[PDB]
Design an enzyme around this catalytic site. Structure first.
Site, PDB file in Angstrom:
ATOM      1  N   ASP A 183       0.783  -1.234   0.000  1.00 21.54           N
ATOM      2  CA  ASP A 183       0.000   0.000   0.000  1.00 21.54           C
ATOM      3  C   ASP A 183       0.817   1.287   0.000  1.00 21.54           C
ATOM      4  OD1 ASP A 183      -2.027   1.836   0.218  1.00 21.54           O
ATOM      5  OD2 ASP A 183      -2.333   1.523   2.374  1.00 21.54           O
TER       6      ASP A 183
ATOM      7  N   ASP B  86      -1.633   5.561  -5.355  1.00 21.52           N
ATOM      8  CA  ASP B  86      -2.064   4.666  -4.274  1.00 21.52           C
ATOM      9  C   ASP B  86      -2.406   3.233  -4.681  1.00 21.52           C
ATOM     10  OD1 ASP B  86      -3.184   3.614  -1.963  1.00 21.52           O
ATOM     11  OD2 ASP B  86      -4.813   5.076  -1.823  1.00 21.52           O
TER      12      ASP B  86
HETATM   13  C1  LIG Z   1     -13.331  -1.735  -0.424  1.00 19.47           C
HETATM   14  C2  LIG Z   1     -12.090  -2.501   0.076  1.00 19.47           C
HETATM   15  C3  LIG Z   1     -10.766  -1.770  -0.234  1.00 19.47           C
HETATM   16  N1  LIG Z   1     -10.636  -1.468  -1.691  1.00 19.47           N
HETATM   17  C4  LIG Z   1     -10.513  -2.635  -2.599  1.00 19.47           C
HETATM   18  C5  LIG Z   1      -9.124  -3.337  -2.419  1.00 19.47           C
HETATM   19  C6  LIG Z   1      -7.895  -2.393  -2.546  1.00 19.47           C
HETATM   20  C7  LIG Z   1     -10.624  -0.188  -2.291  1.00 19.47           C
HETATM   21  O1  LIG Z   1     -10.514  -0.069  -3.500  1.00 19.47           O
HETATM   22  C8  LIG Z   1     -10.711   1.051  -1.508  1.00 19.47           C
HETATM   23  C9  LIG Z   1     -11.757   1.981  -1.717  1.00 19.47           C
HETATM   24  C10 LIG Z   1     -11.803   3.177  -0.957  1.00 19.47           C
HETATM   25  C11 LIG Z   1     -12.922   4.169  -1.172  1.00 19.47           C
HETATM   26  C12 LIG Z   1     -10.787   3.430   0.012  1.00 19.47           C
HETATM   27  C13 LIG Z   1      -9.730   2.505   0.222  1.00 19.47           C
HETATM   28  C14 LIG Z   1      -8.698   2.787   1.237  1.00 19.47           C
HETATM   29  O2  LIG Z   1      -8.918   3.503   2.210  1.00 19.47           O
HETATM   30  N2  LIG Z   1      -7.470   2.203   1.034  1.00 19.47           N
HETATM   31  C15 LIG Z   1      -6.320   2.359   1.961  1.00 19.47           C
HETATM   32  C16 LIG Z   1      -5.677   0.962   2.143  1.00 19.47           C
HETATM   33  C17 LIG Z   1      -6.694  -0.131   2.402  1.00 19.47           C
HETATM   34  C18 LIG Z   1      -6.737  -1.263   1.557  1.00 19.47           C
HETATM   35  C19 LIG Z   1      -7.684  -2.282   1.800  1.00 19.47           C
HETATM   36  F1  LIG Z   1      -7.706  -3.337   0.995  1.00 19.47           F
HETATM   37  C20 LIG Z   1      -8.605  -2.223   2.859  1.00 19.47           C
HETATM   38  C21 LIG Z   1      -8.556  -1.092   3.693  1.00 19.47           C
HETATM   39  F2  LIG Z   1      -9.410  -1.007   4.699  1.00 19.47           F
HETATM   40  C22 LIG Z   1      -7.624  -0.046   3.492  1.00 19.47           C
HETATM   41  C23 LIG Z   1      -5.296   3.405   1.479  1.00 19.47           C
HETATM   42  O3  LIG Z   1      -4.176   3.411   2.358  1.00 19.47           O
HETATM   43  C24 LIG Z   1      -5.841   4.843   1.446  1.00 19.47           C
HETATM   44  C25 LIG Z   1      -6.180   5.391   2.870  1.00 19.47           C
HETATM   45  N3  LIG Z   1      -6.510   6.846   2.884  1.00 19.47           N
HETATM   46  C26 LIG Z   1      -6.672   7.352   4.316  1.00 19.47           C
HETATM   47  C27 LIG Z   1      -5.381   7.444   5.158  1.00 19.47           C
HETATM   48  C28 LIG Z   1      -4.652   8.670   5.245  1.00 19.47           C
HETATM   49  C29 LIG Z   1      -3.465   8.756   6.011  1.00 19.47           C
HETATM   50  C30 LIG Z   1      -2.988   7.616   6.707  1.00 19.47           C
HETATM   51  C31 LIG Z   1      -3.698   6.394   6.631  1.00 19.47           C
HETATM   52  C32 LIG Z   1      -4.882   6.311   5.866  1.00 19.47           C
HETATM   53  C33 LIG Z   1      -5.535   7.668   2.097  1.00 19.47           C
HETATM   54  C34 LIG Z   1      -5.272   7.103   0.690  1.00 19.47           C
HETATM   55  N4  LIG Z   1      -4.822   5.699   0.795  1.00 19.47           N
HETATM   56  C35 LIG Z   1      -9.702   1.324  -0.541  1.00 19.47           C
END
Ligand SMILES: CCCN(CCC)C(=O)c1cc(C)cc(C(=O)N[C@@H](Cc2cc(F)cc(F)c2)[C@H](O)[C@H]2CN(Cc3ccccc3)CCN2)c1
Ligand SMILES: CCCN(CCC)C(=O)c1cc(C)cc(C(=O)N[C@@H](Cc2cc(F)cc(F)c2)[C@H](O)[C@H]2CN(Cc3ccccc3)CCN2)c1
Lengths: 389, 390
Positions: free
Chosen positions: B36, B232
């Site tokens: 990530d 990202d």
């Molecule tokens: C629906 C399941 C996840 N998913 C499919 C698989 C990839 C997505 O596409 C998706 C959608 C959205 C709308 C948001 C996120 C999201 O928050 N990702 C995180 C990482 C993550 C991956 C995962 F697998 C499950 C999770 F709980 C989280 C990323 O670090 C984001 C987090 N932010 C907020 C942040 C800011 C500063 C420090 C930490 C977090 C900034 C941009 N970086 C992921």
């Protein structure tokens, strides 16, 4: 001759627009609507937006009718996308009537709504020729006249305060009057002079001469109307065609040369401030715009003071200084006689007789030495040649 | 390619994340970890969870050190709470080094772990500024570089298959490469173009122009980076600021107007399907994102195909139709160049030189008529004004 029920029904200021209260739907949903003589679509916010604290909820109106068609309106600056429909509309402080009108429910917007303006929609008062998607979408005023006995005319008295109005002040202050279906004599002084509406699309007029402190700008008059000249309550500044803007600024700079201002001021971007009560109004020139009259080879003029073309704004430090922005800008779409110009006059949009009347406003800002004016007649030849084709 | 040991060390897919194998503790405990670049905490499941078949067992590690402090991390979607500590960590298919790193042992979570993703933890590769609880918790890569001779750079090649991978297939398929400490030239074609890392917190970049099939979206470039633009790998979709999303969708609809798709499709919620092999790639436009270059007044562009922004998904009836979801979503937190975008390129996170490089991926999906591209230079003025400031 008097319409007490409509006098003082407007609120707002030049920089954010003047608006009137209206109700849409059944039960009535109250919304504040920007009065815009520069466009022809009636549209209202219909979905949440950070700058709106209320919006049209079609699902709550029993009289809502879906036209199942989209509409996109790009303005000179700003734009919105919406969904067309019709509903019952009324103006609380207007004629005692209810109209079924076309309404564009705004679902997306870009630089359209203004933070703190207090309005949630726009009332395009111009003609069908410029309505979107096309001229088959009947403008509000057209529906109003067709469905009621209201005379085909409206008049506007926009009242600039002459000083800044803060958030609470602008909400409580009377910003003017929109008299629907008539002329109220208490709103102006002197005589009304009329210029013909050249063509019924925008409220188009023809300027035949321009003076800065009596000095003729001396340009081919077609330049003043390239590619058109319109009266627009929906635009703050007096906007002038590039070539005319350049000449006008050179002349205003020359007249006010005892004090030098930064380039940003003349670009209408930065303010200039003076110690409280000391604004040097007298060093700035008056601007006179001569307009085609109704009689052959006859014109009249409207004269504007710096109290009109210098827009009051609050200093960044909220100090006690009196500050302003230069409210004249360059245009690539013709002359726009905006709100700061209309603030000096009572303007009559006599659609029935295809003409626009001007009279000195009973609420214009001036000083002890000069006043705005509407004077005539003047002999002027080949005025039709001033119009651009 | 000079990093054969690390080539093909990733598995997974855009919709569930790409992961790399790591070991934590002594004796080593093997765990799969989500790569990530959008966060900065290294955290692993450390207690039973319905979607985990293994987790970090601190009591079995002789090198585990308890930091006696809790940590809470809310992501854009999903969140977890855990206990901080440190332990020895290695990457089997990575540099041949072992480092002592901070590890958040996840004890509680909500919508974080994904059923069937096969990963049990997350590797936040971004900077300390966004690490939780605060910037004093050194991120894994910072530790790696400080404790070893590994160059301060890593590169990612995320490989989308172009079609659905069932459970067995996704476990056996190579999903890409994470080259730690270098750039492997076998992973891309053409030239690498670099854009400056604007600030070291997220991997923030600046977009200066956007085109849909060559047509300028025509927005003030500041809108493209409101309130920031980041790269990202931890987010599936290309996410765009509200106004940019609205303009982009209007333009993509216009370009693909020969076929009408339901609102649910454009909202990224419902799939659309075509008879096997007949997906009309050609009616969908390419999308070009111009990024600030390293030289003054110079930019370059990366161009993605619908094979990148339409995400393959299995049909609800597991039929023989080829189906997809629109992988572009609206954001309220800036532009996010997610996994579906990264799948078209080899992305070099050059931390040492504060820049991110892009080159066409040797594994991007395309057709016989169009390919993804990375091209430049273009004269672009006042690009600094494209960046947003609060
Ligand atoms: C629906 C399941 C996840 N998913 C499919 C698989 C990839 C997505 O596409 C998706 C959608 C959205 C709308 C948001 C996120 C999201 O928050 N990702 C995180 C990482 C993550 C991956 C995962 F697998 C499950 C999770 F709980 C989280 C990323 O670090 C984001 C987090 N932010 C907020 C942040 C800011 C500063 C420090 C930490 C977090 C900034 C941009 N970086 C992921
Ligand atoms: C900066 C915010 C707005 N603003 C301060 C408050 C008044 C201005 O002074 C300003 C400045 C410029 C350079 C342009 C406009 C402008 O396009 N006005 C519109 C109405 C409007 C008001 C508003 F409040 C926000 C808006 F999005 C729009 C007017 O119908 C213009 C529209 N044209 C284009 C047009 C032509 C035909 C049919 C529809 C539109 C012709 C002249 N009539 C307004």
């Amino acid at each position: 001759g008097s319409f007490v029920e409509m006098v003082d029904n407007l609120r707002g200021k030049s920089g954010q627009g003047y608006y009137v209260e209206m109700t849409v739907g059944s039960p009535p949903q109250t919304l504040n609507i920007l009065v815009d003589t520069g466009s022809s679509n009636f549209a209202v916010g219909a979905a949440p937006h950070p700058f709106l604290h209320r919006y049209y909820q079609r699902q709550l109106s029993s009289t809502y009718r879906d036209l199942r068609k989209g509409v996109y309106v790009p303005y000179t600056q700003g734009k919105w996308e919406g969904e067309l429909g019709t509903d019952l509309v009324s103006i609380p402080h207007g004629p005692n009537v209810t109209v079924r009108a076309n309404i564009a429910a705004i679902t997306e917007s870009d630089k359209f709504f203004i933070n703190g303006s207090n309005w949630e929609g726009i009332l395009g008062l111009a003609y069908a020729e410029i309505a979107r998607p096309d001229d088959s979408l009947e403008p509000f005023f057209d529906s109003l006249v067709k469905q009621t006995h209201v005379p085909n005319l409206f008049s506007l008295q926009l009242c600039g305060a002459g000083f800044p109005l803060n958030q609470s002040e602008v909400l409580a202050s009377v910003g003017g009057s929109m008299i629907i279906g008539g002329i109220d004599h208490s709103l102006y002084t002197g005589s009304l002079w009329y210029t013909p509406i050249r063509r019924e699309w925008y409220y188009e007029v023809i300027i035949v001469r321009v003076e800065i402190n009596g000095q003729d700008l001396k340009m081919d008059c077609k330049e003043y109307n390239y590619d058109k000249s319109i009266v627009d309550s929906g635009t703050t500044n007096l906007r002038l065609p590039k070539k005319v803007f350049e000449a006008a600024v050179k002349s205003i700079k020359a007249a006010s040369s005892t004090e030098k201002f930064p380039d940003g001021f003349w670009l209408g971007e930065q303010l200039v401030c003076w110690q409280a009560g000391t604004t040097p109004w007298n060093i700035f020139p008056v601007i006179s715009l001569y307009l085609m009259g109704e009689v052959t080879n006859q014109s009249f003029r409207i004269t504007i003071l710096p109290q009109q073309y210098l827009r009051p704004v609050e200093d960044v430090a909220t100090s006690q200084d009196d500050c302003y922005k230069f409210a004249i800008s360059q245009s690539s779409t013709g002359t726009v006689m905006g709100a700061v110009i209309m603030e000096g006059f009572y303007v009559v949009f006599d659609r029935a007789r295809k003409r626009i009347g001007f009279a000195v406003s009973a609420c214009h800002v001036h000083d002890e030495f000069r006043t705005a004016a509407v004077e005539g007649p003047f002999v002027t030849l080949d005025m039709e040649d001033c119009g651009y084709n």
